[PDB]
Amino acid sequence: HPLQGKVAFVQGGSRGIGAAIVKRLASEGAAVAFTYAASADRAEAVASAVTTAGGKVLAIKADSADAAALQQAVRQAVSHFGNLDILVNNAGVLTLGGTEELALDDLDRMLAVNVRSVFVASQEAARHMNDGGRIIHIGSTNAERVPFGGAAVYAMSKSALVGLTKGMARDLGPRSITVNNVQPGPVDTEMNPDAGELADQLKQLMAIGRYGKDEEIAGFVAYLAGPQAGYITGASLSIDGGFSA
Template sequence: MNTKFNGQVAFINGGSRGIGAATARRLAREGAKVAIGYAASAIAAEALVEEIRAAGGEAVAIKADAADAVALTRAIDSVADRYGRLDILVNSAGVLRLGPVDQFSLEDFDHTVAVNVRAVFVASQAAVKHMKDGGRIINIGSTNAQRMPFEGGAAYAMSKSALVGLVKGMARDLGPRGITVNNVSPGPVDTDMNPAEGDFATALHGLMALKRHGTADEVAAMVSYLAGPEAAFVTGADLLIDGGFAA
């Protein structure tokens, strides 16, 4: 462990698996107290907490359904109450529902917006009430905001594109307090949602400059940079980490 984030508290919404879990490990290893928000993966969240504690870090799992604004706000408030502060918010919860526009249900559309867009706004609004000047808000976006090269991804691409505009506006609102707001936008990353050996891997690699999936740890490293002091002048940005998918 190092002391980059010593004394700081991070809430990671959607932190039990994939990129969120890798981010929780990274920030905890660098000294942050980490609250892992989860919707349904209680076993995975508690296992991650135990893993972090065994490595000498401090972590807690908090049930927080991203689609439930009241529950999400309550979870963030509880973390701030528990530790007396909140310094870093990582919005990592997300859903991927695919289908052609003429068959895509309104229920799936509304759920996509609720988790991928509204939850980011709700969590950010709740977090900034507890943040001191210089806090950090980091969203996990997607390279599909820049390029959607296959059918069925309109709603998903729209939801991630919305975050680009949201961070620009929020960066202006929170700039006077020194709170930065940024997106990290991955391309194909080896997770349960999009495994490197999955059915679409070869096709995806054919669209990329680097012919491989990224790793969750690589994305977590960029999140750590944005959360740290060296990124104090970076805000309102949408930073691609996509192996040249959108190049």
């Protein structure tokens, strides 16, 4: 239990990678607060995986596009569990569209969730975080390799986290708080399943030749959130089966 007595906040915790990160942090001993936007039933099942195995959880309905709601969620977590040790920013939106075609709505909405809300949550968490804490952003290997058309705005929104991570590391390093950007490649989830022509296309660009599992992203996040990782900061850390080699 390397996270015994720690408090973690996970933005986007109810499905896919987020759900795996909540369960893993809780299995190492952290109390976990997490946000969800879409499904109370998915959130309940995550919360039950935490407690059936003896961990402490708080599920919070909060739309990551709304600045006020996110800051409110972080304060609710703090009232519930005390000051945060760990923040994981896992909210993320994807719309495909060419430069000439993408709707201005769709732009605004990737910026809101993938960028704005990462800063918004980081700022409120930082105001209620213990020294020696950990902020982990979940980015994308598309910050580094964009092999096809249609991903301009999504890649932009994920490459934004590179500079964010560097400058946050400088800001919070005097408090011994680490800040890192985890950059996954394709991960097998319901909305991006390891099945079909697109997945084969993507697997051809990878050195490993399978999609990543949620548990593997979770494992890396947990390592970074842990007592062994106090010297890793400002880094963008690829976990992508060699997609970006």
